[PDB]
Design a binder for this molecule. Structure first.
Ligand SMILES: *O[C@H]1[C@H](O)[C@H](n2cnc3c(N)ncnc32)O[C@@H]1COP(=O)(O)OP(=O)(O)OP(=O)(O)OC[C@H]1O[C@@H](n2c[n+](C)c3c(=O)[nH]c(N)nc32)[C@H](O)[C@@H]1O
Ligand SMILES: N#Cc1cn([C@@H]2O[C@H](CO)[C@@H](O)[C@H]2O)c2ncnc(N)c12
Ligand SMILES: [Mg+2]
Ligand SMILES: [Zn+2]
Ligand SMILES: [Zn+2]
Lengths: 114, 301
């Protein structure tokens, strides 16, 4: 019944002042994109940076199994748009936040469905 | 002086035609650092400028294009060049990458190990290599043609590059190979391309554009590398990151280039003309299968 909870480990490490995972791969782009959260090509808007998805995925970067019976990664091979205000910690942002299954924006950072 | 607004500078044709002897490379801005946009890694800027230049050539871009990228890892364990290539290439393009050392990648498949362990059934439409031997820094004699991964790359090109396909293989003053230059003459066109962000380095990408599978031109590669160093030695390039700011036309155009299987007997001059113009790829269009050779040892006793 034992499994490592790496998401919690990183969340607590951050909470206690640890420096975020670095070397997330930031892309050059127009910054006139849709602003959707996770895309097949960079889609940052004026308020976002775009990153290569693998480099922003805690499981990819930590060499650990993905939380998924199939182990499928929803970031690798795509681009993640991160609010510029949070781009110091893309891995933390993707862990803590959620994508709206309807409009494809981050809940709280673009999703206007409510 | 408009060179600064380009992605970089390609070796002018008149320097290719010379017969120079090899000198030491002595760049006036050697090692100077470009000012990159905030938070952008060198390899992202470098690969962006490489792709921007490749947008000016006649690359074949088929549906289900196949691209392989050697030397794709970093000491940081991520793959910035692969991320730029996948951004540049049409969505759905099959992208495989590889490196000696472990890294995580946005590529569809990644093989870790010496490139000589990498094998594949299929032919490829574009080959990218950024491999460089750290021991090349231990310069202790005349600058001779290097082997190692360059020997693999030449064979891989001759064996596994589709006709019409293209390559970009990173070289430097001391990281180079005479047979790779010679093989540039087996393409419809070739150059040595220096990125504006790394204009202070003797790095260049040797680009073969539209592979013909036979020599169009006989190139002595010892002479051509000397020509390249001569060009670099006498043509200072000012560092520039200007082109990084305009990404509106960055994506590689999906040309839908035709793929045909054809046997070595059906390649006539009209076919060769289509290949030369970026208008045809010739290879099987089967499924893509790759593998890494694994050496087995039991170290007990
Ligand atoms: O961006 C680098 C790229 O990732 C790779 N690379 C270089 N070192 C690497 C290591 N240790 N590991 C992995 N990958 C490495 O190669 C790219 C280019 O690196 P760069 O340092 O800019 O290459 P460069 O110095 O131009 O060419 P060489 O490495 O082949 O030269 C070896 C040796 O010769 C002297 N040298 C070369 N050049 C062009 C010189 C010059 O213009 N002026 C002077 N005074 N000396 C020059 C140097 O001693 C150099 O180290
Ligand atoms: N010599 C050699 C090789 C160097 N590299 C890599 O190129 C990258 C160079 O900047 C680096 O990440 C390195 O690890 C190789 N990769 C596979 N096979 C090889 N034979 C090599
Ligand atoms: Mg440099
Ligand atoms: Zn992942
Ligand atoms: Zn929504």
């Amino acid at each position: 019944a034992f499994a490592v909870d790496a998401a919690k480990a990183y969340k607590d490490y951050l909470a206690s002042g640890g420096q975020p995972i670095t070397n997330c791969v930031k892309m050059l782009c127009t910054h006139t994109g849709t602003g959707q959260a996770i895309t097949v090509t960079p889609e940052a808007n004026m308020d976002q940076e775009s990153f290569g998805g693998a480099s922003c995925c805690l499981y990819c970067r930590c060499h650990i199994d993905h939380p998924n019976p199939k182990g499928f990664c929803d970031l690798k091979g795509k681009y993640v748009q991160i609010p510029t205000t949070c781009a110091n910690d893309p891995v933390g942002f993707t862990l803590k936040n959620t994508v709206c299954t309807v409009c494809g924006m981050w809940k709280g950072y673009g999703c206007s469905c409510d | 002086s408009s060179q600064a607004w380009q992605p970089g500078v390609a070796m002018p044709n008149l320097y290719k035609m010379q017969r120079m002897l090899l000198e030491k490379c002595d760049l006036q801005n050697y090692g100077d650092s470009a000012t990159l946009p905030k938070g952008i890694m060198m390899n992202v800027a470098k690969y962006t400028q490489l792709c921007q230049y490749l947008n000016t050539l006649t690359l074949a871009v088929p549906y289900n294009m196949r691209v392989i990228h050697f030397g794709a890892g970093s000491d940081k364990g991520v793959a910035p060049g692969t991320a730029v290539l996948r951004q540049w290439l049409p969505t759905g393009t099959l992208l495989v990458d590889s490196d000696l050392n472990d890294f995580v990648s946005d590529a569809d498949s990644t093989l870790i190990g010496d490139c000589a362990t990498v094998h594949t059934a299929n032919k490829w439409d574009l080959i990218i290599s950024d491999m460089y031997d750290p021991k090349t820094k231990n310069v202790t004699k005349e600058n001779d043609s290097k082997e190692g991964f360059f020997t693999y790359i030449c064979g891989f090109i001759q064996q596994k590059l589709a006709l019409g396909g293209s390559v970009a293989i990173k070289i430097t003053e001391h990281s180079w190979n005479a047979d790779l230059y010679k093989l540039m003459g087996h393409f419809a066109w070739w150059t040595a391309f220096v990125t504006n962000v790394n204009a202070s380095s003797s790095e260049a990408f040797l680009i073969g554009c539209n592979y013909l599978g036979k020599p169009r031109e006989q190139i002595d590669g010892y002479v051509m590398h000397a020509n390249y160093i001569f060009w670099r030695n006498t043509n200072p390039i000012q560092l520039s990151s200007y082109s990084l700011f305009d990404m509106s036309k960055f994506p590689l155009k999906l040309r839908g280039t035709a793929v045909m299987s054809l046997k070595e007997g059906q390649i006539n001059d009209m076919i060769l003309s289509l290949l030369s113009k970026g208008r045809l790829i010739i290879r099987e269009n089967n499924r893509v299968v790759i593998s890494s050779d694994v050496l087995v040892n039991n170290e007990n006793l």
